Amino acid sequence: IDLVTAELGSDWPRLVAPTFDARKAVVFDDRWASAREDLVKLWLAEEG
């Protein structure tokens, strides 16, 4: 492991560490909810 590090360097092994996992995903399929709140904000704040 010392020899492998000697060739590749310090940053390469540390940055190659895994990140992605299947449980942290977030899905936004709602327009219906966000469109309603979007309109009432326009309606109340109307100036121009």
Distance of alpha carbon 34 from alpha carbon 18, whole angstroms: 34
Distance of alpha carbon 39 from alpha carbon 45, whole angstroms: 10
Q: In the 8-state DSSP scheme, what is residue 43?
A: H
| Binding-site size, a second copy (CB under 8 A) | 8
End-to-end CA distance of the chain: 66
Residues numbered 1 to 48 that lie near a second copy (CB under 8 A) are 1, 3-4, 7, 13, 16-18
For the CB of residue 10, give the shortest distance to a second copy in the complex, in Å.
13
Nearer to a second copy, 13 or 36 (CB): 13
Judged by the rule CB under 8 A, the positions of this chain that interact with a second copy are 1, 3-4, 7, 13, 16-18
